[PDB]
Structure formats: C-alpha cells, structure tokens
C-alpha cells in the first residue's frame with residue numbers, strides 16, 4: 001500500500017524471501033541472526049540478518065526503503081554493503097548484510113586475546129578515514145560514527161556502518177549534523193582505537209559534556225598514540241567546523257604517519 005512509484009524505485013533493493021533463509025535460533029546491534037541468501041546467479045552467500053522491530057507505519061517503511069536505496073548505491077571496500085532488504089507480509093522488515101567474520105571494531109580491539117600494534121590501530125583508523133572520504137564525496141552525513149559501528153571482515157578490512165560523547169560541539173547545541181561534525185566523531189573514533197576501546201570521557205556525565213568542551217577540555221592523549229596522531233585528533237575537535245580537516249586531508253595525513261611505522265599483526 002506504499003506509493004507505486006516508490007515501490008518501483010525500491011525493487012532493486014528488495015530480496016524476495018523465497019531466496020532468504022534466516023536462522024532465527026542462531027544469534028549474532030542487538031537482533032542479528034545468521035542467514036543464507038541466494039543471489040541471482042545462483043550464489044549461496046552467508047549473511048547477517050537484522051530485524052527492524054521498531055517499524056510500524058507507511059512513513060517509517062517509506063523512510064526505511066529510501067534509506068535502503070541510498071545505502072545500496074554505496075560501493076566501497078571500507079563501507080559495509082547492503083545486500084538487500086526483505087519486506088515480510090507477517091513480520092517486521094529485515095536488513096541483509098554480508099557476514100563480518102570479526103564483528104565490530106570496538107569489541108575486537110577491547111578483547112585481550114587480540115594484540116594489534118600501533119601500526120595496526122592507525123591502519124584501522126586509516127581505513128575508516130577512506131570509507132568516510134567516500135561517504136563525504138557522496139554528500140552523505142553519517143551522524144553515528146563510532147568504533148562500535150565499524151565492522152571487521154575476514155581480511156581485516158574495516159567497514160563503516162550505522163551518542164553525545166561522540167558528537168561535535170555544534171551538534172550538541174544545535175542538532176546540526178554535517179560531514180564536518182562527522183570529522184569530530186572520527187577524531188573520537190581515533191581515540192577509541194589508540195586506547196584499544198576505552199570509554200571516552202569516563203568521569204563526565206552525558207549532560208555535563210557541553211560545558212566540559214566549552215572549558216577547552218579535550219580527550220587526553222592515549223597511551224598508544226603517537227604525537228603526530230594526537231595533533232590530528234585535536235584538529236578534528238576544533239569548535240569552528242570549517243577549521244577541522246576534510247576526510248581527504250585525513251586519509252593523506254594519517255597515511256603518512258602509518259607509513260613511518262613497522263610491525264603489523266593484522267595486515268591488509
């Protein structure tokens with residue numbers, strides 16, 4: 001009962017459920033299941049399937065669909081691909097995504113069994129930068145960039161996907177979100193990596209954050225963070241949006257630091 005022209009625009013994003021199996025008893029965000037998708041050439045592919053249970057009316061479904069149209073257009077190694085969406089007749093809709101072996105980046109860097117070097121963590125920060133560079137080039141604002149929202153596949157390739165302590169100054173006071181506010185959040189993401197998943201601003205409450213920043217207080221330099229990279233963080237946290245670097249400047253800048261380092265436990 002959605003708009004006919006909108007339904008036609010979405011068809012390329014929709015998966016006929018006749019080609020999807022969802023292992024509802026195999027859980028992986030938080031409602032995420034193992035799935036098996038059958039692609040149009042006959043390819044059986046292993047996916048993660050999330051059920052968007054918070055949907056209800058035509059508006060939300062419409063929003064959801066056009067969001068899907070956008071996400072589906074995005075092709076980049078460092079951006080999580082949407083494989084499709086599934087509109088079930090008797091159940092809330094499903095997002096279908098490629099399976100990511102190593103889950104999200106925050107969990108991966110937090111667990112003590114893993115031992116990423118300084119080069120590894122900068123490397124992970126660099127890949128995020130590349131994906132964000134691409135997203136910005138497509139005039140897409142992320143709004144929710146954080147370590148927890150970046151995925152990590154079998155090749156250790158970081159995928160961007162979608163929070164006051166990550167938000168830019170001008171977003172906290174004006175709910176204004178731009179690619180330059182994404183930059184502020186990417187700076188926080190960098191701090192997250194170089195701390196190996198520490199919680200940002202531990203001793204300041206979610207409401208006292210804005211006055212904290214207006215004092216000039218910033219996240220302290222992480223134990224693992226090289227001085228040139230800490231200066232990159234602070235540029236990302238300048239109050240005037242236009243002063244902050246572009247993601248293209250960040251790819252080129254961070255890459256230069258990355259190249260000075262040797263020793264990787266997780267390559268590519």
Ligand SMILES: COc1cc2c(Oc3ccc(-c4cnc(Cc5ccccc5)n(C)c4=O)cc3F)ccnc2cc1OCCCN1CCOCC1
Pocket residue numbers: 028029032047048049050064065067068069071080082085095097098099100101102103104151161162
């Ligand atoms: C929970 O961990 C995983 C999560 C995975 C995953 O999560 C998701 C990421 C993004 C999205 C998502 C992406 N995009 C949108 C916007 C959108 C709006 C409208 C239309 C289309 C899209 N929305 C709304 C979304 O929800 C959904 C997800 F389910 C996707 C793929 N693979 C995953 C793999 C995982 O774990 C691998 C195993 C880890 N083990 C290892 C040993 O340690 C213990 C566990």
